[PDB]
Amino acid sequence: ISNYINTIPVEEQPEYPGNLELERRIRSAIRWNAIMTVLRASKKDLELGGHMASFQSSATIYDVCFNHFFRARNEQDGGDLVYFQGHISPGVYARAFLEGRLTQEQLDNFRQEVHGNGLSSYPHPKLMPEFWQFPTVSMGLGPIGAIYQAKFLKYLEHRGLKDTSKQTVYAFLGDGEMDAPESKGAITIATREKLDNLVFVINCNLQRLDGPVTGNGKIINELEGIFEGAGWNVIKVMWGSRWDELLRKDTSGKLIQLMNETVDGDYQTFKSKDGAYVREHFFGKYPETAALVADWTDEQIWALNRGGHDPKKIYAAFKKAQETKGKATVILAHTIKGYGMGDAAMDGVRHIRDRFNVPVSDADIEKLPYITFPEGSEEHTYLHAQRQKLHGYLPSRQPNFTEKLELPSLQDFGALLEEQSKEISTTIAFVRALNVMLKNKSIKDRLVPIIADEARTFGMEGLFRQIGIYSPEDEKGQILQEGINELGAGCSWLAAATSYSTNNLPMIPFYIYYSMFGFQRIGDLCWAAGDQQARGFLIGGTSGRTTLNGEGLQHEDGHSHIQSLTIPNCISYDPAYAYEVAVIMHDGLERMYGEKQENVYYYITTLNENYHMPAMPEGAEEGIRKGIYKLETIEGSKGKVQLLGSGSILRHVREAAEILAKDYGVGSDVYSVTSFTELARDGQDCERWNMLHPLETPRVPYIAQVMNDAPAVASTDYMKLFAEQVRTYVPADDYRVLGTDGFGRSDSRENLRHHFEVDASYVVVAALGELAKRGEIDKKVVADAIAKFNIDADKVNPRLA
Amino acid sequence: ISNYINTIPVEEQPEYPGNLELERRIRSAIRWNAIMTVLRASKKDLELGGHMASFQSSATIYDVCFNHFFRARNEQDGGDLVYFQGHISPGVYARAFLEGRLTQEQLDNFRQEVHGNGLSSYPHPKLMPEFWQFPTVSMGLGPIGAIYQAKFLKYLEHRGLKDTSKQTVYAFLGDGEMDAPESKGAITIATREKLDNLVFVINCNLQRLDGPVTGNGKIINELEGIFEGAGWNVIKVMWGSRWDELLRKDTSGKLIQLMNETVDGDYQTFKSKDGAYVREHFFGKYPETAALVADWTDEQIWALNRGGHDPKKIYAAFKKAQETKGKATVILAHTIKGYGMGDAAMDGVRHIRDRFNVPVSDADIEKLPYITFPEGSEEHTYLHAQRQKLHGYLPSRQPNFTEKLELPSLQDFGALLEEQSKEISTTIAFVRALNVMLKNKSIKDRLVPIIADEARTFGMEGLFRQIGIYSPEDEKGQILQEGINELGAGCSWLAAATSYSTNNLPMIPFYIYYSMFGFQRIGDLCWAAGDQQARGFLIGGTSGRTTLNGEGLQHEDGHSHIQSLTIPNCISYDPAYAYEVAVIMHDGLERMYGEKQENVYYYITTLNENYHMPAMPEGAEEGIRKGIYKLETIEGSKGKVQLLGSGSILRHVREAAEILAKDYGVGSDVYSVTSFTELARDGQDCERWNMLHPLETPRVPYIAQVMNDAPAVASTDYMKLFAEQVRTYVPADDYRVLGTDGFGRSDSRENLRHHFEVDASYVVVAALGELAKRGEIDKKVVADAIAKFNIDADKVNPRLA
Ligand SMILES: Cc1ncc(C[n+]2csc(CCOP(=O)(O)OP(=O)(O)O)c2C)c(N)n1
Ligand SMILES: Cc1ncc(C[n+]2csc(CCOP(=O)(O)OP(=O)(O)O)c2C)c(N)n1
Ligand SMILES: [Mg+2]
Ligand SMILES: [Mg+2]
């Protein structure tokens, strides 16, 4: 760790290129409007909330960036990708308002978006599709998301897809936010990948939200130590310009010593006291130091400010970051929380107006007016000119990509639609579907297969030879191998899945991993992905509680679909056959990257178990997309039931269909449910519509148009709720669901399917049970099936096992 | 970083205290049995899986620890807490077998546990409650979990609850696992908390599972740099004893230069070659280095080994770590993946038999026999003598704590069962409940309130001045403030929630945080918590999609309950009133820390919205615990409906009941649903049981015992599925569900509830519509109600909004 002073000594500090006075007048208007927006919202007394202190402490850091660094989207590239600290949004809206991009009506509707003309609390592309770009309010996601966005930009360049060399990724973070594991856990990656297009800006105001990050230590020293240890270029912006003379005079190096020994707690103390108290406890600690401020007046000593509030120190840091190559840069900016707010952190409103020389008269101050700069005014001219030289205004977002892709047709997946000679898995089918896409000249280079170390398990090695692994195995490799880092891989997927908007370059990512380590491990990222309008495919491999049989409790996934259904724009499927996979992937491509350009992403679970793959029934396409289609109708004179199955369990449901007809004369309609979730959502939409249109004829849920009223049984490799989801819509009086509720454990597939009570024998017993309650068969035939199938009717409920 | 050589020179190396020859014989037997176990499982051809290469590389490291360092649980403390690397479990099972703690039948049931006499693939306490202690297979969780476990041990000593000064926490990690953000994301905490009771042992065999961690880099230097930068004491065990002479006579310093410059990829290539190759490509890089081994035979050069395979080098490292204070230590052990297995890594396996001088006939190898040491033999005597000196065997685990706690009675929370004076929230109710617990002499000091920075947002301020904040606000402080670090806070919660087992010292953690950043963000930890049998409370504050109205899309939680219902042993509640919070907390406390010692943890969502808190209706306690109870019935001669509500939406449902009665003459039964999930689970357990016992009296779902058959409407602040999950069990033909499906957005609570179609207006229309379909009233009345309430029958479905 170096001394507690600026990394860039004044001797190496470049001259500041801007008009300080004018930029400050503009900055003051932004500070004012940001505050008025929050205060006006507050007046409504609707508990809307909003922050002020945060933006106040970092306004100058952002101001320097908007005036001299941030490149807006242009014809060449998407510009600088800025991960704004979420809590400073009022500051971003304030500036956008001044730039005339937001109206006063919109600002007056800060945090009131239901009626269509408001502003989101934080950066949410989903809510403001033409304004915000990156969701950052979930502490920790911004930094790791930024690292991988930066790596993805390199990837796009290395693969000759787009020249992104002029794009810089900025991640603005708080020192408290650095406590999140995701904030520092992936920094060595920036070093390995030599991400010189990534800049971390850490606002070290030493004040989290409920106290300091570390009062007994020095958070800046901790951050420097670990970032330096990680190979990053660390730039500390500790003190303002007023300290430089003192540092030069300091010949005994006693001042440096004083600053080094002084701890955070001490520094936060002086912050509240006065100039006398400072030159007493601080400067008044050594004859050499106390002598430094002898000619200084208590007024001049109290003027000493921190580097994060000095445009000149800030510019030097960003400039150096911009020039650095070979490694990522982190700027530790020392600021004051609640800067210039005195009171907090009309008397208070008057204080800041005077503190920042805001152009608002006493006559208008009561009205909390917004300040504007008329066209022709010096401020208006400078504001727009600085931005014009930087290609425009940011943030901004284009909701749709412009080019038109020539997507492969379903026919191109022809081989997958016919019976398979060999027994394969849906995972192998997925890989084969990828190969089809890899043969489409229009999208072949747009595909981004992503893996987290394990590739052999997913039979992806076959692609390694075809398209290679991205490894700046060379920089032309198409596959992203992120190793044991699902969060990093997910961030790579997100960068690729939103490339269509960010760089107007549609990339189609396919992230394959252990389904268990998907939404469960990176769910916060999947939620952010929906907010970011990601369009891609998440492939949950080795899914199903009973299918990844030998791995046990922390690997067997019987609930990822329950987690995925919580995401509004995530479309989920659990296909049993190779042709369903083909149809679903095709529909997904067409919907997301076809003319429709729907803002959804696909979650498809695939299996590691091989079995016979039949041919797709004629006309089953639409049913497969909708989520359900009748596979076949097995005849039977002693009764009729409906059997629904999905994923690896469908095969067993069909076995049960045979047993029911062969041994009990019970016929049935067997349906393959490719997506219980899509069916449930369709049902919900129908009932909602019916409720709001009482004078109209009721709409019928699709599942209800496909099924009849005969007793039904459903079984899947996921917890029961996955299939119980559609209960309200099933037009039968009886609907029994089997599922894999409970912790997984190690064993053979057969033992697990029996243990979780989802195999053929249980489907049969469940079906006979429903028929028995209808009087179609004697309850005793049910009790005998139980004995016959060696079913332990008294074993503990698997959910409790 | 330092030179690519051992941190501890021979001169400073303590004499090895054990019998090297004897230990070698014992270790060879363990290596052998570990391999026999996995191979025997392979023979069954049931896709059980299992690894061998990993343990082979770290076997000697664990051997030195088992022989000279690992202290087993004893009368004074829980002994050393070892986070074993997940996939090396066959080696731990093999040692347990040799120690006589496991039988051959168990080894033969490796990864076949459904029938009760098998072994889990990985460390899963839930599955082997008396053997394993810490789930580590989910890469990344072990490191951070271990850090917070060590911090918790010091917490227990500082608080004067237990002297843990003789306990050391060991975390064995692989170098590839260090890529998970969680692995290094929290290592600076070990320095902040001066965790000299923590030792990280990183097995640096230089490769993941699909290849090297960093082929073109040096992972060991990368780790040294970041851990040292983090303030940790780093000890590198690079080379075996045979290198000492070479390094001693190398007066040119060239050998060191050679070691420093060679990258991981090259080192890995040497292993797959031979002596001549190494003499040429390694030592042959320089005249000086070539001369050092010039008089050496190719066989002697090939004998040079990595430090992690030399007991003397390993011993020295662990001994040094034991004497280091004021900071944590990380040992970087250089090893060979697939050590002694030949080739890459029936009869071909006779290679390992020869390599490790395994005492097994070259004729019996076909049977894959396990080796054992008969009592009275040098090996047996030594094996046990070393462990006895270290208090016994590990791992081992006590499923229940021994002491008896005198928990508070429901009456002690009496104040919370009465009508509250002013309007408060369920979060304020939660805090008041905590204060009641803090007056209980038996558990007051065992309580561990945990907060993720934000504490004043949850009204925790009052508790600070009362019990203080842990800050070794002093060492006696009781509250754990972990800052913006949900995962860290969750790991502290986990350490506390499992203290009853590891230290036989029950502690009762209450971790309150923003519900949106609960399961969605630390879901994998919550799953591991279930596996680890955690007993504590997770309090999801500021919950409900429409209740945290200003925050928007990434804060408005309308689905944490959907995610929590996926964890088998997590009991979830969403109470609307203060008395419900009191009843739930009391019950949870009694179930987990009372005589029952139920292995479950609680998840309770609380609100930030104040409203009238009525008195608990007499006799509602059990219904509150079960998930539902009837609040009241309202008379009406024109019709009758059932209205269900939970959390903050319940009061709006009651508003609807009044409207229906006064404006339309429609009466109703109003129910408060404290837990739709427990009701759903109960329902599922009932029908599961009924399905399996077709001849017996069917069990009736609890919800069916509370509700009748009149058309029903349910509304909650969560997505429809939260309430729809009980459809199957609801005894009414009509069950309409209103929910907050779709991404949240900022606005007033009033506007969000209308937008999400969950306010009183929608409940009324839903109810009137159900009656219109039954011909109870003219459809026009429903049409007119829609108009009167300003309902936009055609606005887009909120899920798509
Ligand atoms: C994952 C997550 N945890 C917690 C929060 C709540 N939160 C928002 S800001 C904040 C503290 C702000 O401190 P810092 O990150 O240092 O930034 P500052 O506002 O001081 O610049 C917290 C805990 C959140 N939004 N997301
Ligand atoms: C979160 C998570 N992702 C992936 C895996 C799959 N996995 C099991 S072992 C392994 C590689 C382990 O490599 P390393 O940590 O270097 O240890 P080694 O076996 O070489 O000692 C992986 C990726 C897992 N268990 N958990
Ligand atoms: Mg801060
Ligand atoms: Mg390794």
From Swiss-Prot, chains A, B:
<feature type="binding site">
    <location>
        <position position="175"/>
    </location>
    <ligand>
        <name>Mg(2+)</name>
    </ligand>
</feature>
<comment type="subunit">
    <text>Homodimer. Part of the PDH complex, consisting of multiple copies of pyruvate dehydrogenase (E1), dihydrolipoamide acetyltransferase (E2) and lipoamide dehydrogenase (E3).</text>
</comment>
<keyword id="KW-0479">Metal-binding</keyword>
<keyword id="KW-0670">Pyruvate</keyword>
<dbReference type="InterPro" id="IPR004660">
    <property type="entry name" value="PDH_E1"/>
</dbReference>
<dbReference type="InterPro" id="IPR035807">
    <property type="entry name" value="PDC_E1_N"/>
</dbReference>
<keyword id="KW-0460">Magnesium</keyword>
<keyword id="KW-0007">Acetylation</keyword>
<dbReference type="InterPro" id="IPR005474">
    <property type="entry name" value="Transketolase_N"/>
</dbReference>
<feature type="modified residue" description="N6-acetyllysine">
    <location>
        <position position="630"/>
    </location>
</feature>
<dbReference type="GO" id="GO:0004739">
    <property type="term" value="F:pyruvate dehydrogenase (acetyl-transferring) activity"/>
</dbReference>
<dbReference type="InterPro" id="IPR009014">
    <property type="entry name" value="Transketo_C/PFOR_II"/>
</dbReference>
<dbReference type="InterPro" id="IPR041621">
    <property type="entry name" value="PDH_E1_M"/>
</dbReference>
<protein>
    <recommendedName>
        <fullName>Pyruvate dehydrogenase E1 component</fullName>
        <ecNumber>1.2.4.1</ecNumber>
    </recommendedName>
</protein>
<keyword id="KW-0786">Thiamine pyrophosphate</keyword>
<dbReference type="InterPro" id="IPR055152">
    <property type="entry name" value="Transketolase-like_C_2"/>
</dbReference>
<feature type="binding site">
    <location>
        <position position="207"/>
    </location>
    <ligand>
        <name>Mg(2+)</name>
    </ligand>
</feature>
<comment type="function">
    <text>Component of the pyruvate dehydrogenase (PDH) complex, that catalyzes the overall conversion of pyruvate to acetyl-CoA and CO(2).</text>
</comment>
<dbReference type="Pfam" id="PF22613">
    <property type="entry name" value="Transketolase_C_1"/>
</dbReference>
<dbReference type="GO" id="GO:0046872">
    <property type="term" value="F:metal ion binding"/>
</dbReference>
<keyword id="KW-0560">Oxidoreductase</keyword>
<dbReference type="Pfam" id="PF17831">
    <property type="entry name" value="PDH_E1_M"/>
</dbReference>
<dbReference type="InterPro" id="IPR029061">
    <property type="entry name" value="THDP-binding"/>
</dbReference>
<dbReference type="InterPro" id="IPR051157">
    <property type="entry name" value="PDH/Transketolase"/>
</dbReference>
<feature type="binding site">
    <location>
        <position position="205"/>
    </location>
    <ligand>
        <name>Mg(2+)</name>
    </ligand>
</feature>
<dbReference type="Pfam" id="PF00456">
    <property type="entry name" value="Transketolase_N"/>
</dbReference>
